[PDB]
Design a protein around this ligand. Structure first.
Ligand SMILES: [Zn+2]
Lengths: 691, 579
């Protein structure tokens, strides 16, 4: 009864399941320029499982969940909507200011050419009105400028209008009159507004979000027209659903269309998937590390609110809309063994990929790769990673590691082979830190969950440096990006702002409670028009974001009971204090005065999904130790004959022997010495230091 | 030679991790992001003996100011420090920033040996001058500027030296801000110590310090290898400053660079020191010259002392603008003298390297330090860093120059305050923070345009600038940049609710503003590159229509004349291009 679409840009992941809970996986790579290939070229193959009509059988799916980030591609292709900007006089070009400088450190250069504009000052129309920090209209809305700018927008063939005014988050009448003027000019023109996209503080971020939403939203509009037509013409009973970066399925069939909450969502289900993999094991806080030869994607679920994020900056454009905070750092399996002309072995900056390939692939591969060092260590033998022409060459990797890394560095072939990999694993550790320490505390409490491709070659090593006790490997390699979107329920993030001091002054209980319950009503209306689960229990968890006086950046606070007063007000500050403490130092509290923003996310827990599960006859696991391979793990330095197991015939998990490699027809798992692993009925390998 | 390369990279990368950790501790708590001077800090790791092993140099105002910082701090306390102590100072004795930048020093002990120092700086709100800015134009008996702090312990073997911390708390207009920010400095220095101790535990001093000596050597050889590829000889640069000392004109910084293959020696030759806070001292001038070097070689990499092992500097005799001793008892400007100093040194280094000639930036020209009694019944004070954020990234062979760059004395890592961030935090109306027309460069590639900050007080506000170089702008570009007709900065006050127009040469007295009156200051933009008659025709047309260059501009700067017409008049285009 469920289909999931994960367009990953290399192949296309097609996830199909029914009451069996069987994770049935198809592939159908689509041209970067149109995605209708995935639907119509995948459904023909799902007819091939039972022998049922592909036009008929989509009707049996209660959910078609499509996660796609073509809006990200639109930001990339320099392709979009010619956007008009309605802005406040005197601050008309703040978008181009970008707060001074923020650019040295993430992408870098000598001659950084950042910030290709989305509004070119041809569409930077100021409006003379102005208000201030409390909602007082210092100067009224300049309707003349608006009318003239509308005529001008007609002149320049504008296609979408973004509006962002000063201080409208507490007095939005100016933006509202402007948006009314545009929509009431009766143009066939989609209009965005600051208070209706991201009504919070820091105007630059609000304006950037509004302009990007103006740039992309109607593209998603046309996409939903085409795809709703495809699925409703193919026989779907229910409204189609689309996977967001909030973890839920809003778009297309709701009262709110906004691409900014669809930008680079894709595999942001990764933590939702991690918990759907780990919960039968009783792991509360987990980190998924999904990777391929392309990059590394790291994320937590809970603890510090790594669950969500701050004002993110996508590629050069500042998008504020709440999203799950993940870290994508560098090139993974098919990355180059970079060795600069400065004496530094900085392996890992640039991906060789499959096109020149690793030296293993012979398609033009010169530089050694993580795949090349992996083979040099004896982790791959005949070829067990991807579904195509693999063409496994081996010694070229050993000699290339020698002459390109080992020979010039004054290190042996074996050392360079292990070291390339050491540095990659440490990069993964750093990525883990960006979300684990910077948002919380010691990862020792969490389980890693590897999945996909090259992750199995570095998770264990990475876990060994991270300190994870438990490593989880779904036996169905594509299971993570599948589960986390298929088990996606309805999720509405509703936010607002409320500058109010909690200390140095008596909190206005009625006002704080009013804002909180009004956000609750907003969530209630969101579900009212999306579809409220029938006598289905839903939850609103509150978040208040506060700071000490004079600081800029806040910290999040959880709120459990649905209304708040003094006997729980003081504890509120406690929630803050330790929180600030945990991020910065061991004793902060003197005046935790300022509160800034308020948020409630309503969750409608609607999923009733099937899951696969096993059963067991006996204790044998007799015929798995499939031969031996000369393998070097950095801890031996003698290349012991380390065993190789066939992961596809392993009987229900029996305790595994020490150091080994588990190869499946699909992927490859390392087990460094000291670890003990079994295959739990839930189609997950549990790896734990039982030795 | 017994340095394992894998473990070498591991050590350097672990250090990079700890540096980010500390920098973030300050970045989100220190208030030196949009309220204290923005990103006016750099945290750094120094050795058992006082040598810097890694600086994540994010802002270059702390480029050469830290190298001979540990010299006198660590050398005046020979043996008599212990685990748990911290030394604290800001004074320019033989080191140091402008005294509003103060910093904390913690040495790391390991089973009885001293292994390395952790240094945590940050720009503070006030230091205790008669002027709330700390930037005080009245430099009589130079002690007028503020509180100077020599090496004093503020922690000792794990405890607060409350006796003295309260001496330093007073003589400063902020109290709780100062207190919390020192708390954040201690926090950052503590995590900097914790990670590095974990490093010593995993490796042992015998490995960590071996790899560190190797990294110093790597920096040394890297800089020397670069120097091998520029011609030997004697080169010089000379650039001036005139809007100084009540606007009195003064002679230049003469930066002679003498390059013999692997090494370069730098002489400075500045005019005599002044009764103005723009005097410079040792660490200040050293950062200035190092910035002269870095502006054309490379911005990105990680930094340590090794880089400057082949760069010897000589500022000239004491008592001059570039090298003062006690005879000019104070300095708040690592901005005024240093800009001209850096220009001169870069001009020398580019005279040797025509390959990498770039155009000058705007210096930032533009401070406005403001605040007073708010609607909140307290003291609210800030530097309007916004007033001085953006000029333009000069202009290169292949760049128009970004008008989103910081200090303009400097690489550009500075970050402006956002409007709403400021109107809640401050009792003002930020009336305009817009971008200028015909304020940038003129060349085949023009510079970026700067800011127009127009500010209006809501109840009461004071305005402090004092900063120099706003009319005679030696921002001239790459030998062919024209600058035919351009606007510089004016410190302008419209007062009495009538069209006041008290135009101040940027060295402003302490001004004040009444509700409705407006203070305006603008940021002069960067230079130009080459001849502007060669700037692409469609590009010049777009630039004029973009609303950054006027037609009146275009006709005379670029030889691309527009009319109350559609495109450009085929013949009017070329008629004006005789020269
Ligand atoms: Zn400073």
């Amino acid at each position: 009864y469920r289909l999931g679409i994960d367009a990953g840009g290399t192949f296309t992941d097609f996830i199909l399941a029914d009451h069996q809970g069987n994770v049935q996986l198809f592939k159908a790579p689509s041209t970067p320029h149109d995605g209708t290939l995935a639907i119509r070229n995948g459904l023909a193959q799902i007819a091939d499982a039972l022998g049922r009509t592909p036009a008929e059988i989509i009707a049996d799916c209660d959910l078609c969940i499509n996660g796609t980030t073509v809006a990200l591609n639109a930001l990339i292709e320099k392709t979009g909507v010619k956007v008009g900007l309605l802005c406040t006089d005197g601050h008309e070009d703040s978008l181009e200011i970008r707060l001074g400088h923020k650019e040295d450190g993430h992408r870098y250069d000598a001659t950084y050419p950042p910030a290709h504009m989305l509004v070119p000052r041809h569409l930077r129309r100021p409006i003379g009105g102005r208000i201030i920090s409390d909602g007082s209209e210092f100067s009224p809305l300049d309707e003349a400028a608006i009318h003239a700018a509308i005529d001008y927008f007609r002149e320049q063939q504008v296609q979408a209008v973004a509006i962002s005014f000063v201080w409208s988050v507490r007095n939005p009448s100016h933006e509202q009159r402007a948006m009314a003027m545009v929509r009431a000019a009766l143009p066939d023109v989609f209009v965005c507004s600051g208070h209706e996209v991201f009504p919070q503080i820091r105007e630059y971020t609000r304006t950037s979000t509004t302009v990007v939403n103006a740039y992309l939203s109607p593209v998603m509009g046309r996409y939903i027209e085409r795809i709703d037509a495809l699925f409703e013409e193919l026989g779907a009973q229910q409204p189609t659903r689309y996977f967001q970066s909030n973890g839920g399925l809003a778009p297309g069939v709701v009262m709110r269309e906004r691409a900014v909450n669809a930008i680079n969502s894709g595999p942001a289900s990764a933590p939702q998937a991690g918990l759907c993999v780990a919960q039968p094991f009783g792991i509360d806080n987990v980190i998924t590390v999904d990777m391929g030869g392309t990059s590394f994607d790291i994320t937590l679920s809970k603890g510090g609110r790594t669950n969500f994020s701050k004002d993110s900056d996508f590629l050069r454009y500042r998008i504020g809309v709440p999203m799950i905070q993940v870290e994508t750092l560098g090139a993974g399996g098919g990355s180059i063994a970079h060795l600069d002309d400065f004496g530094m072995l900085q392996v890992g900056p640039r991906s060789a990929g499959a096109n020149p390939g690793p030296v293993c692939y012979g398609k033009g591969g010169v530089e050694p790769t993580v795949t090349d060092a992996n083979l040099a260590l004896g982790y791959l033998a005949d070829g067990a990673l991807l579904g195509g022409s693999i063409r496994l060459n081996r010694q070229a990797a050993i000699d290339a590691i020698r002459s390109k890394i080992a020979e010039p560095l004054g290190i042996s072939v074996e050392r360079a082979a292990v070291g390339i990999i050491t540095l990659v694993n440490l990069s993964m550790v750093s990525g883990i830190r960006r979300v684990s320490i910077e948002r919380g505390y010691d990862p020792r409490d969490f389980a890693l969950i590897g999945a996909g491709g090259a992750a199995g070659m570095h998770v264990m090593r990475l876990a060994e440096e991270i300190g994870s006790k438990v490593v989880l490997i779904p036996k169905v390699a594509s299971g993570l990006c599948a589960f986390g979107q298929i088990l996606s329920d309805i999720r509405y993030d509703q936010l607002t702002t409320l500058p109010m001091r909690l200390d140095d002054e008596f909190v206005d209980l009625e006002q704080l409670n009013q804002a909180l319950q009004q956000l609750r009503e907003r969530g209630m209306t969101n579900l009212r028009d999306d579809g409220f689960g029938g006598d289905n229990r839903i939850e609103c968890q509150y978040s208040l974001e506060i700071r000490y006086l004079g600081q800029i950046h806040e910290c999040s606070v959880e709120l459990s009971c649905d209304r708040l007063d003094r006997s729980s007000l003081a504890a509120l500050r406690e929630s803050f204090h330790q929180r600030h403490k945990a991020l910065f130092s061991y004793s902060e509290p003197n005046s935790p005065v300022e509160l800034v923003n308020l948020e409630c996310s309503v969750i409608a827990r609607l999923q009733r999904p099937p899951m696969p599960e096993l059963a067991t006859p006996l204790k044998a696991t007799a015929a798995i130790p499939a031969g031996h391979r000369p393998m070097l793990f950095n801890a031996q330095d003698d290349w012991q004959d380390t065993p190789v197991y066939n992961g596809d015939r392993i009987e229900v998990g029996q305790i595994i022997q020490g150091p080994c490699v588990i190869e499946e027809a699909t992927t490859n798992i390392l087990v460094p010495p000291g670890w003990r692993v079994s295959l739990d009925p839930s189609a997950t390998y549990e790896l734990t230091p039982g030795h | 030679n017994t340095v394992d390369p894998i473990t070498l990279a591991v050590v350097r990368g672990a250090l990079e991790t700890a540096q980010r950790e500390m920098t973030l501790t300050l970045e989100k708590t220190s208030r030196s992001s949009v309220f204290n001077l923005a990103h006016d800090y750099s945290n750094a790791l120094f050795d058992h003996l006082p040598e810097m092993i890694l600086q994540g140099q994010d802002i270059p105002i702390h480029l050469g100011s830290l190298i001979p910082a540990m010299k006198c701090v660590a050398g005046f306390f020979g043996d008599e420090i212990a685990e748990g102590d911290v030394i604290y100072h800001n004074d320019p004795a033989y080191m140091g920033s402008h005294i509003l930048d103060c910093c904390m020093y913690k040495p790391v002990f390991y089973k009885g040996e001293l292994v390395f120092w952790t240094v945590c700086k940050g720009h503070l709100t006030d230091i205790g001058g008669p002027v709330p800015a700390g930037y005080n134009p009245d430099a009589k008996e130079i002690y007028a500027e503020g509180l100077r702090i020599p090496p004093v312990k503020l922690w000792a073997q794990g405890q607060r030296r409350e006796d003295v911390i309260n001496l330093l708390l007073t003589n400063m207009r902020a109290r709780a801000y100062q207190e919390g920010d020192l708390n954040a400095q201690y926090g950052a220095c503590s995590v900097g110590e914790r990670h590095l101790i974990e490093l010593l535990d995993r490796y042992g001093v015998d490995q960590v310090r071996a790899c560190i000596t190797e990294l110093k050597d790597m920096a040394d050889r890297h800089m020397r290898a670069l120097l091998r590829d520029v011609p030997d000889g004697f080169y010089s640069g000379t650039a001036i400053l005139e809007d100084s000392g009540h606007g009195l004109g003064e002679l230049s910084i003469t930066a002679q660079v003498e390059i013999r293959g692997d090494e370069a020696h730098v002489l400075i030759e500045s005019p005599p020191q002044v009764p103005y806070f723009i005097n410079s001292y040792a660490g200040n001038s050293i950062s200035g010259v190092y910035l002269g070097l870095m502006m054309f070689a490379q911005v990105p990499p990680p930094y340590n002392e090794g880089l400057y092992r082949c760069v010897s500097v000589d500022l000239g005799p004491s008592g001059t603008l570039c090298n003062a001793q006690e005879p000019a008892p104070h300095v708040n400007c690592t901005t005024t003298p240093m800009e001209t100093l850096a220009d001169a040194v870069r001009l020398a280094l580019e005279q040797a390297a025509p390959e990498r000639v770039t155009a000058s930036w705007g210096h930032a020209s533009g401070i406005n330090i403001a605040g007073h009694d708010p609607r909140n019944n307290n003291d609210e004070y800030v530097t309007m860093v916004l007033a001085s954020v953006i000029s333009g990234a000069g202009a290169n062979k292949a760049m128009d120059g970004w008008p989103a760059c910081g200090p303009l004395c400097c690489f550009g890592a500075l970050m402006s305050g956002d409007i709403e961030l400021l109107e809640y935090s401050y009792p003002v109306l930020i009336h305009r923070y817009s971008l200028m027309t015909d304020s940038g460069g003129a060349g085949e590639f023009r510079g970026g345009s700067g800011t127009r900050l127009e500010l209006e007080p809501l109840k009461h506000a004071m305005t402090v600038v004092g900063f120099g170089e706003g009319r005679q702008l030696p921002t001239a570009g790459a030998a062919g940049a024209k600058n035919v007709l351009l606007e510089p900065k004016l410190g302008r006050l419209i007062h009495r609710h009538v069209d006041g127009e008290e135009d101040h040469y940027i060295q402003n007295t302490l001004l004040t503003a009444q509700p409705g009156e407006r203070v305006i200051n603008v940021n002069p933009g960067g230079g130009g590159y080459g001849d502007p008659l060669r700037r692409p025709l469609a590009t010049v047309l777009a630039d004029v229509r973009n609303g950054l260059v006027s037609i009146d501009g275009a006709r005379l700067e670029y030889g691309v004349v527009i009319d109350g017409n559609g495109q450009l008049d085929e013949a009017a285009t070329h008629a004006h291009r005789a020269a």
